[PDB]
């Protein structure tokens, strides 16, 4: 550890620059893997709906499947709601 | 003295102003009173025209509605 | 197929005739290379948006890479030349023959 | 020549890009997706030399509407037909394809 | 060059070749042959001289030319098909662009001064390099598409090839010249089986590749690289003089040697195909590349040329680096013709 | 359209002053005022010979982190995908590649000028 | 109307280019203890106008050894590309709305590079073609950190459109959310001018005028005008990009005030550069940017990049 | 129809003719510079926005470097301009004429040209009819760089250290 | 190859929506939630036939859907409607955050008369 501490006192006198870009670059590869919100980006990505619900035909066997956007089968967006 | 300056700056900023404001004041002029429609995507090109074409008088921003349905 | 395609299929032809023959400089003959690849990205590009070939949009920018470390290797190569001869005059490149 | 280690060891390297009937961002369709689907579905399990004995009338289709050479010789037989006849006098344009309508929402 | 710089040049240029080898896609294929480009020139350039720095000037502008003319092959063959996988080109215009870029990468005839300039210019290791892998990689895009080739085209280049190689290594005194117009004659060879058998064409390519080896490593260690220099060879060490002399005398297509396989092979295919006038013509002419190869092992083992002084000292003093295959690369391409009914597992 | 018309009467207005400016003032031009300006002496040799270039490496490596760049910049729209996971892991490995082709450069010193 | 637009757009930044030449003037003097032009006209403000047109009547020349045709390209080039560089820019309305207002803004800035170029090379003088090289060492440095900086900058954002970063910026200000980027950014922008310290082009201490050294008359009173326009058009891109401005659809006229305001601002602290610094050796330039505010500039991407993934905060696409 | 992407593309070969007839570096830069600004042009009217302005910003990108290179490597006492040779005016002449005569042949006539058809008609004909809606399909397909396309990327990065190296190895000299 | 099929111009006639992109939007998620029916089997038919011929009818039915919509708009709440459909169509964008007090009287109204 003793070595470690004095290269890291004779960079931040010398290359106080390189220190943070090293700092800031280590943050940013480690961080993303920890966080508990990137599941919460992915999916909100998810949720974007860009083109058009095309309907199921409906088999008569299909129970999780909405009949109606207002019956309370589907997808709920009540977590992005409160977020 | 230091605020023998601003008369230049206040010239300066008196043209800067022109650009933006001509450019509103042009936007709401040609559109009806409305800002200009922002058309980024196919879609709302499409409701423009749509629009111009349900129009009459080949103008998008001539609106219609319920009087124009019955 | 329409003429632009014919004038961007003349324009790589052109740029392929211009390399074959040289004149006195390599620089000039790097740039007529670079020029083909010119053609090459704007044909791919005006075939894969008249097709809507979606996936094939990120063909072009991996074309202009290559392009690029293709045109890197050539100033190299030039300025190899150059410092060994004083000009970059490719009667220079003579000491090896068939 | 060809070493098939994506087929060996399961991987998908280029074969994602290679046509463009396959998975497209956003299900965004090609422009001849369903001819592309046509003549490989046509053309599969055969071999090179059946299919092009045998799939030659949706490689056909597929070409056409690559390409669109049909299509234009028929549009510029039209138009080159329309300014004969509009030349001498014999044809006139009705007033929806001059310009004299409302067309639809 | 730093050894770390050169074994990761030389890791580049075997990962272009290969994810050309592997690639199922046209992008890909020119990728693979960009990096292998990129990564071969400083090979070229590592002992630096002028001489160097003009072979890898004449091969990257060579190069250049055909993945330009690679990659228009490639765009005018999506255009009329909209296809990117390998197969049968649908075009043939793009298919004579892409036999065209293909043949000026392999150095195939009247594309070929390049090959005898370059390796020339280059040292031993970088043109035993050079020629080996830059042959193997066209060679495997052409197999792949090889049921679209133009026969005619195709055998065209490659008889030219066949004679320029000759007239050319008939002419030679400087070996690697000499090798690089054997390499132009092998490579005629085997483009003119390709139209008919892939499976001839990698017998060959395998058969050229372990002669080419041999040779490049004798010579090598001989550190020779003119005939009078080889001369001197008998003084020191006979017995390489001895190797390299069979090695010759294989790589001439004399039986029974090793040699004799792929010119056989190839010609017993291309009968089967009711070619007679083809095959007559290349095996005659073939005694070309005998002819040199025979005066070649004059010169070195058959005959003994004047020494000099300081050979003594070179006697006092022993070889140290040992080539590695050196032996086995030697028998290979000598006593192999009796199995030649392995090319079924080549298949 | 409107880009166009803009450009044209950006060149037009710009041809326009210079026309006014070539024309308007007058004119009396002689050997020793069109001469070239070196301080008050002739110039010794000519302009047009070779004029060495001191960072000729670092403008080879500048067209590969122009590459770079264009590389890097469909990132806002690739941020919108599902796969962030792996958008990130690419995103990180072009930069660090990066990141490491910048200090090759500088250890092994092609970042300083020729002497 | 869209020609009115234009003259619109046109006229009044060349009148506030004169008006930038005469405030420079009088903030150095001030700066300097001195007064500046308080004697052409009332508080100096006809100087800009007795300048405009001593200069347009006053013999322009080219030099005997001068290639005329790219000699009187440059001007033209630089000019029109000075006034094109406004045309996209929300104040609060663009006048040509693109969906990627900031790429366009990049090609035309590289395309703005060469006028100097080709100015200093057509001269054909050993100080012109100097500046020009001076050029292109800049050009490089700059160039590279300014497109990674405005990556990351609109990495933030969600897109390349100007109207989308008012948007962003409705309710703080993307200095206060990436202060680092921009000071880089500043100092980028500043050497993109070619403003001082980075005035290496044109550096009248070391080379006599630079690059324009063959230039006068009316030809370089056109160059004067493209530095000038180029200042205040970068300026307001930074005002756009950092300063945001609280925007009403129903008056307007609040956010041109704000942007305007902002903007001389901005070049007012340019010309206080200008007066407190000394001027940079290119060389240090070079190895300003490349060693120390690249690999900051690519951690500071890497971090923005992260940033709105592990946070959730991903901008809309549109 | 207006012919933009038409007249577009002829001043697309014009400017080819012109750095190919090979001037000198510096006017072949001036032409490559005016025809990549013109390919941008003409795919911003096929579609590509940001493939038109990322091909201009990388080749005014690469030109200044070749200006750069051009004054010190490839200058000499009176740079070559198209009139000051007659091998150069006679290969852009030639140029000339053969577009013009192709042009020519193509708006009379359906042109066919040895190698392949070409129908005089609409390249607003040729395009689709189908729209897609509030997102650009070539950004998507460009972004689709990073979730598809890793291999892609990995021999893109690859290629590009190793440029670094190369260029580093091959100006080393010693 | 065969003669193309078209419907005649005749049974191509229906009773147009004659209301702006602006109208549209203001009531869009009312619209989506009462005509789901219609729409919904448009879009099904229009994705399984993969041919405009083919479902005429539901597009008939689909626009029907809309003016009895539209009706039921105008003969309850034609002023509440009529302002938040102006306030919407002021915004270039047409951004529904401008208007959330036009929009709460539009939803207010709705609510309570139908
Ligand atoms: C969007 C643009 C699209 C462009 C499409 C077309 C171009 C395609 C690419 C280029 C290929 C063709 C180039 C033109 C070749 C013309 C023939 C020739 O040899 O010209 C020599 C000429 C140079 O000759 P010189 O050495 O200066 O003349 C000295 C003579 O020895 C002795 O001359 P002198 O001393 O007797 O002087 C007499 C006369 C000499 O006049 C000329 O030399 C005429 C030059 C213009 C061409 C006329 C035909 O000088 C004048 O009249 C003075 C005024 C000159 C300024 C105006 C120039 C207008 C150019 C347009 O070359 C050029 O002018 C090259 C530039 C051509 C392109 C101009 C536009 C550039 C735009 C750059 C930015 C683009 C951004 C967007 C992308
Ligand atoms: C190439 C551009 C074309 C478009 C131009 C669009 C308008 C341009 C507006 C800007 C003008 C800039 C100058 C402003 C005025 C000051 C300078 C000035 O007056 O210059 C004029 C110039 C002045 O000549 P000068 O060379 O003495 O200019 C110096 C002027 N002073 C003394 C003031 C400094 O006039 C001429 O060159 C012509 C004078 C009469 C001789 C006519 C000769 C015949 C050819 C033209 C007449 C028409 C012939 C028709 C028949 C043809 C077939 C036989
Ligand atoms: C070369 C000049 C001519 C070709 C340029 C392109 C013209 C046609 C553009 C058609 C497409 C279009 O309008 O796109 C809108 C787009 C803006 O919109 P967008 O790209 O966001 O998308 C279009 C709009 N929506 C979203 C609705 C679809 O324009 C641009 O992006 C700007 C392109 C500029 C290209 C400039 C090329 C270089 C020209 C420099 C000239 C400088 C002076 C030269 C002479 C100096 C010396 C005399
Ligand atoms: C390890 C083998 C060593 C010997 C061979 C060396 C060959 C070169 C090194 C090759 C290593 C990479 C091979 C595997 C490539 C993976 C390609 C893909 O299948 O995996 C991706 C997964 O990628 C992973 O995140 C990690 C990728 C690898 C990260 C970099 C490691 C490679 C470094 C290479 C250094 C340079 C050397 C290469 C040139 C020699 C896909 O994930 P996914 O999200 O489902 O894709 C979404 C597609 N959808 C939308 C259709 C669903
Ligand atoms: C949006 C902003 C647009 C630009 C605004 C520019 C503002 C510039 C500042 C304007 C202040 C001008 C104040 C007036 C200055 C001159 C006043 C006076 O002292 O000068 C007169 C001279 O004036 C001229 O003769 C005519 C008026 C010209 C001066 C006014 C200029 C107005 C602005 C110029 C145009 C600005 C845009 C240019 C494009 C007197 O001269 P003269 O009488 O003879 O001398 C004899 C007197 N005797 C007989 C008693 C001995
Ligand atoms: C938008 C408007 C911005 C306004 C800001 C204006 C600032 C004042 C303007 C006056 C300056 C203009 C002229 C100055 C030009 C020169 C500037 C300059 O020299 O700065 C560069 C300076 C000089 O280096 P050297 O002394 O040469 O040392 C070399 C060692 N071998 O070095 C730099 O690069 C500084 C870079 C500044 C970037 C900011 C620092 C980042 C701070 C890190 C904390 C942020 C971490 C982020 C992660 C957060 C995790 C929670
Ligand atoms: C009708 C002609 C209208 C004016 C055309 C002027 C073209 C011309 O021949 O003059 C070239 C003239 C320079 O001539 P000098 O050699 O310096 O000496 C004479 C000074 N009057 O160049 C110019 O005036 C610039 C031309 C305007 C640029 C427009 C190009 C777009
Ligand atoms: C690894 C994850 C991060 C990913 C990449 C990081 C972003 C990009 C950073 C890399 C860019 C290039 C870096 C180049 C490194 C070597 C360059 C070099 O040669 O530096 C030497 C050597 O100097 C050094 O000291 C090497 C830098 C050592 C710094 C590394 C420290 C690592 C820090 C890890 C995190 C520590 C956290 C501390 C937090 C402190 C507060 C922020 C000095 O240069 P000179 O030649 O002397 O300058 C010219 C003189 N005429």
């Given at each position: ?6 290269f ?6 010398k290359?106080?620059v390189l220190?943070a ?9 480690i961080?993303p893997?920890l966080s508990?919100?990137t ?11 860009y083109?058009?619900?095309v309907?199921?035909?409906?088999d008569?066997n ?5 009949s109606?956007?207002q019956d ?5 967006l ?6 | 003295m230091?605020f023998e ?5 206040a010239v300066m900023?008196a ?5 933006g ?6 936007h709401?002029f ?5 800002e200009?429609r922002?058309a980024?995507?196919?879609?709302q090109?499409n409701?423009?025209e749509?629009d111009?074409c349900?129009?009459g ?6 609106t219609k509605?319920?009087e124009?349905?019955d | 197929?329409?003429?632009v395609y014919?004038n961007?299929?003349?324009?790589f032809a ?8 040289y004149?006195?400089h390599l620089m000039?003959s ?5 020029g ?6 704007i044909?791919?590009?005006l ?6 070939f979606?996936?094939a949009?990120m063909?072009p920018?991996?074309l ?7 045109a890197?290797?050539?100033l190299?190569l030039?300025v190899?030349?150059?410092?060994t ?10 000491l090896?023959?068939? | 020549?060809?070493?098939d280690?994506?087929?060996?060891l399961?991987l998908d390297?280029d074969?994602?890009?290679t046509?463009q009937?396959?998975?497209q961002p ?6 001849c997706?369903?001819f592309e689907?046509?003549?490989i579905?046509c ?7 059946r299919?092009?004995?045998?799939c030659?009338i949706?490689?056909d289709?597929?070409?056409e509407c690559?390409?669109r050479?049909?299509?234009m010789?028929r549009?510029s037989a039209?138009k ?12 006139t344009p009705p ?6 309508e409302?067309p639809?929402? | 060059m730093n050894?770390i710089?050169?074994t990761?040049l030389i890791?580049t240029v075997?990962?272009?070749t290969?994810?050309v080898?592997i690639?199922?896609?046209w992008l890909?294929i020119?990728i693979g042959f960009?990096?292998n480009l ?6 070229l350039?590592?002992n630096?001289?002028?001489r160097a720095?003009?072979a890898?000037?004449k091969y990257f502008?060579?190069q250049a030319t ?11 063959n999506?255009?009329?098909?909209g ?5 049968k080109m649908?075009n ?11 043949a ?7 594309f070929h001064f390049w090959?005898?300039?370059?390796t020339?210019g280059?040292?031993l290791?970088?043109?035993?390099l050079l020629?080996t892998?830059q042959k193997?990689a066209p060679?495997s895009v052409?197999?792949?598409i ?16 066949i004679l320029?190689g000759?007239w050319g290594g ?11 117009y054997s390499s132009?004659?092998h490579m ?14 990698i017998?060959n390519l395998?058969?050229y590749?372990?002669?080419t080896?041999?040779?490049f ?5 001989s550190?020779?690289?003119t005939t009078?220099?080889?001369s001197?060879?008998?003084?020191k060490?006979?017995?390489?003089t001895?190797?390299?002399?069979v090695?010759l005398?294989?790589?001439g ?12 092979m ?7 195909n009711?070619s ?9 002419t073939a005694?070309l590349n ?5 005066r070649?092992a004059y ?8 020494s000099?002084?300081?050979?003594k000292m070179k ?11 050196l032996p086995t690369?030697?028998?290979l391409?000598?006593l192999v ?8 597992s080549?298949? | 359209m409107?880009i ?8 037009t207005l710009?041809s326009?002053?210079?026309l006014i400016?070539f024309?308007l003032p007058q ?5 020793e005022?069109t001469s070239?300006?070196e301080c008050?002496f002739?110039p ?6 070779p004029?060495s270039?001191?960072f000729?490496?670092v403008?080879?490596?500048f067209?590969?982190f ?7 910049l469909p990132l ?6 599902n796969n962030?996971?792996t958008?990130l ?7 660090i590649?990066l990141?490491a082709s910048l200090?090759?450069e ?6 300083e000028?020729?002497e | 109307?869209f020609?009115?637009?234009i003259?619109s757009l046109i006229?009044?930044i ?8 005469l ?5 150095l003097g001030?700066?300097?203890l ?10 100096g403000?006809?100087q800009?106008?007795?300048?405009a047109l001593?200069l347009?009547t006053?013999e322009?020349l080219r030099?005997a ?5 790219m000699?009187?390209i440059?001007?033209?080039?630089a000019?029109?590309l000075?006034?094109?560089?406004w045309v996209?820019?929300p104040?609060?309305?663009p ?7 900031v790429?366009?803004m990049?090609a035309?800035?590289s395309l703005?590079?060469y ?11 050993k100080?012109?073609?100097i500046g020009?090289?001076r050029?292109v060492?800049?050009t490089?440095?700059?160039?590279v950190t300014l497109?990674?900086?405005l990556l ?10 100007l109207?989308?970063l008012?948007?962003?910026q409705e309710?703080?200000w993307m ?7 921009a000071?880089?950014?500043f100092i980028?922008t500043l050497?993109?001018?070619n403003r001082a310290p980075?005035?290496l082009?044109?550096?009248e201490?070391?080379?006599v005028?630079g690059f ?5 008359a009316?030809?370089?009173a056109?160059?004067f005008?493209?530095e000038?326009?180029?200042?205040i058009?970068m300026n307001?891109?930074?005002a756009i990009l950092?300063?945001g401005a ?9 956010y041109?005030?704000?942007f305007?305001?902002?903007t001389?601002?901005?070049t007012?602290?340019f ?7 000394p ?6 330039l070079?190895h300003?940017?490349?060693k120390?505010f690249?690999?900051?500039t690519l951690?500071?991407?890497m971090?923005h990049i992260?940033?709105?993934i592990?946070?959730a905060?991903?901008?809309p696409q549109? | 129809?207006m ?7 002829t001043?697309f070969?014009?400017?080819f003719?012109?750095?190919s007839?090979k ?9 490559l510079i005016?025809?990549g600004g013109?390919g941008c042009?003409i ?5 590509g926005?940001?493939?038109g302005?990322?091909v ?6 690469g ?9 010190a ?7 070559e301009?198209?009139?000051?040779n007659?091998?150069?005016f006679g290969?852009f002449?030639?140029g000339?004429m ?5 042009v ?6 359906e042109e066919v ?5 070409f129908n005089?008609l609409?390249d607003?004909?040729?395009?689709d ?5 509030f ?15 890793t291999?892609l ?9 190793i440029?670094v190296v190369?260029?580093?190895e091959?100006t080393?000299?010693? | 190859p065969?003669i193309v099929?078209?419907?005649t111009?005749?049974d191509?006639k229906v009773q147009?929506?004659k209301?702006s ?5 203001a ?9 789901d029916k219609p729409?919904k089997?448009f879009?099904?038919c229009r ?5 405009p011929?083919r479902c005429?009818?539901?597009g ?5 859907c809309?003016?009895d919509?539209?009706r ?8 509440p409607?009529t302002?938040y459909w ?6 270039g964008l ?6 959330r007090?036009?929009?709460?009287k ?9």
């Open positions: 550890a003793g070595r470690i501490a004095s890291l006192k004779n960079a931040w006198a290359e106080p220190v870009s090293f700092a800031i670059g280590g943050l940013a590869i961080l893997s508990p919100y599941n919460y980006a992915i999916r909100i990505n998810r949720a974007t709906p083109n058009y619900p309907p199921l035909r409906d008569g299909m129970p999780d499947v909405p109606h956007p309370p089968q589907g997808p709920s009540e977590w992005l709601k409160n977020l | 230091w300056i601003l008369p230049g700056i900023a043209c800067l102003f022109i650009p404001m001509a450019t509103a004041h042009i709401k040609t559109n009806g009173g409305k200009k922002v980024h995507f196919s879609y090109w409701l423009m749509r111009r349900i129009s008088v080949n103008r998008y921003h001539v509605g319920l124009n349905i | 197929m329409p003429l014919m961007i299929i003349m324009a052109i740029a392929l005739a211009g390399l074959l023959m004149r006195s000039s790097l740039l007529c290379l670079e083909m690849m010119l053609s090459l990205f044909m791919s590009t075939i894969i948006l008249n097709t809507h979606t996936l949009n063909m920018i991996i202009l890479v290559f392009a690029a470390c293709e890197a290797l050539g190299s030039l190899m030349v150059s410092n001869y004083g000009t970059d005059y490719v009667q220079n490149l003579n090896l023959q068939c | 020549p060809f070493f280690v994506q087929k060996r399961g390297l074969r994602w890009m046509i009937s396959a998975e956003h299900k965004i369709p090609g422009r997706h369903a689907k046509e003549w579905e053309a599969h399990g055969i071999g090179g030399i299919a092009e004995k045998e030659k949706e490689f289709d597929f070409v690559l390409l050479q049909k299509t010789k549009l039209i080159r037909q329309r300014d004969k006849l509009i030349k001498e006098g014999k044809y007033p929806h394809h001059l310009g004299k409302d639809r929402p | 050894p710089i050169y990761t890791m075997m990962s272009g290969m994810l080898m690639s199922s896609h890909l020119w960009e990096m990129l990564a071969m020139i400083p090979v350039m590592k630096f001289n002028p720095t003009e890898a000037t502008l060579t055909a993945s330009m003319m690679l990659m228009m092959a490639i765009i005018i999506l255009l009329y098909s296809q990117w996988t390998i197969t649908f043939p215009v793009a298919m004579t662009m892409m036999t065209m870029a293909l000026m990468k392999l150095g195939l005839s009247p090959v005898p300039e370059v020339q280059i040292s290791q970088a043109g035993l020629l892998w193997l060679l052409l197999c792949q090889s049921q679209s080739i133009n026969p005619n085209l195709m055998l065209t280049m490659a008889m030219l090839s320029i000759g008939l002419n030679q005194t400087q070996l690697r010249k000499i090798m690089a132009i004659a005629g060879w085997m483009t003119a089986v390709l139209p008919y058998n892939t499976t001839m064409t017998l395998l058969i590749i372990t002669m080896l041999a040779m490593m004798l010579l090598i260690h550190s020779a690289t009078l220099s080889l001197h060879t008998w003084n060490m006979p017995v390489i001895s190797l390299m002399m090695t005398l294989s790589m297509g004399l039986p029974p040697l090793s040699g004799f396989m792929p010119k056989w190839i010609i017993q295919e291309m009968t089967k009711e007679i006038i083809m095959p007559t013509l290349m095996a005659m005694l005998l002819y040199f190869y025979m070649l010169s070195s083992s058959l005959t003994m040329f004047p000099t002084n300081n050979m006697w006092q003093f022993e070889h140290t680096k040992q080539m590695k295959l690369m030697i028998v391409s000598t013709l009796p199995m030649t009914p392995a090319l079924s080549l298949n | 409107n166009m018309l803009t450009l044209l009467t950006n060149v710009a326009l002053l210079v400016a024309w004119l009396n031009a002689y050997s005022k070239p300006y008050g002739d010794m040799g000519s302009a047009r010979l004029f270039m001191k000729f490496l403008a080879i490596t067209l590969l122009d590459l770079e760049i264009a590389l890097l806002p729209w690739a941020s919108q995908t962030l996971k958008m892991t690419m995103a990180l490995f072009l930069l590649l990141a200090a090759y500088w250890t092994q010193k092609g970042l000028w020729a | 109307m020609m009115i637009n003259l006229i009044p060349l009148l506030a280019v004169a008006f930038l030449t405030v420079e003037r009088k903030v001030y700066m300097q001195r007064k500046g032009p308080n004697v052409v006209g009332p508080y403000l006809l800009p106008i007795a300048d001593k347009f006053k322009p030099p050894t001068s290639s005329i045709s000699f009187i440059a001007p033209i080039l000019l029109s000075a006034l094109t560089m996209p820019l104040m609060p309305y006048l040509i709305n693109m969906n990627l207002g790429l366009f990049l035309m800035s703005a590079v006028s100097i170029l080709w100015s200093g090379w057509a001269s054909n003088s100080y012109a073609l020009a090289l050029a060492a800049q490089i440095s700059y160039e497109a990674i900086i990351s900058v609109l990495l933030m954002n969600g897109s390349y459109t109207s989308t008012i948007t962003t309710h703080i200095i206060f959310t990436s202060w680092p980027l000071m880089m950014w980028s050497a993109e001018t980075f005035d082009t044109e550096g201490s070391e080379l005028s324009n050294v063959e230039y006068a009316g030809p370089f056109m160059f005008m493209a000038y326009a180029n200042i058009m307001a891109f930074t950092f300063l609280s925007h009403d659809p129903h008056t307007p006229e609040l041109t005030i704000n305007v305001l902002k001389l601002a901005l007012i602290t010309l206080w550069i200008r007066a407190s610094y001027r940079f050796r290119y060389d240090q070079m300003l940017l490349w120390s690249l690999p900051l951690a500071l991407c971090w992260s940033l709105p592990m946070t905060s991903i901008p549109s | 129809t012919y933009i992407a038409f007249i577009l593309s001043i070969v014009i400017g003719v012109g750095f007839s001037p000198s570096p510096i006017y072949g830069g001036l032409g005016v025809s013109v042009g795919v911003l009217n096929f579609g926005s940001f493939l302005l990322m201009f910003l990388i080749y005014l990108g030109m200044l470097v070749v200006f750069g290179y051009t004054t490597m490839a200058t000499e006492m009176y740079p301009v198209w009139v000051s007659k091998t150069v290969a002449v030639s000339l053969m577009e013009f005569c192709m020519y042949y193509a708006l009379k006539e040209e040895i190698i392949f058809k005089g609409g607003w004909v040729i395009y009819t189908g729209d897609s809606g997102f650009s399909e070539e950004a998507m397909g460009i972004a689709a760089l990073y979730s598809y396309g291999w990327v990995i021999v893109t990065g690859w290629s590009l250290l440029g190369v260029i580093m091959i080393r000299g010693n | 065969g099929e078209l419907p111009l005749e191509l147009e929506v209301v992109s602006s109208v549209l939007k009531a869009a998620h009312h619209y989506g939630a009462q005509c729409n089997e879009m099904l994705w399984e036939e993969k041919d011929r005429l009818e539901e008939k039915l689909v626009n029907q809309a003016l919509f539209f039921q708009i105008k003969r309850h709440c034609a002023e409607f302002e102006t306030c919407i169509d002021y915004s047409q951004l529904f955050r401008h208007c007090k036009q929009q709460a539009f939803d207010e109204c709705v609510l309570d008369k139908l």
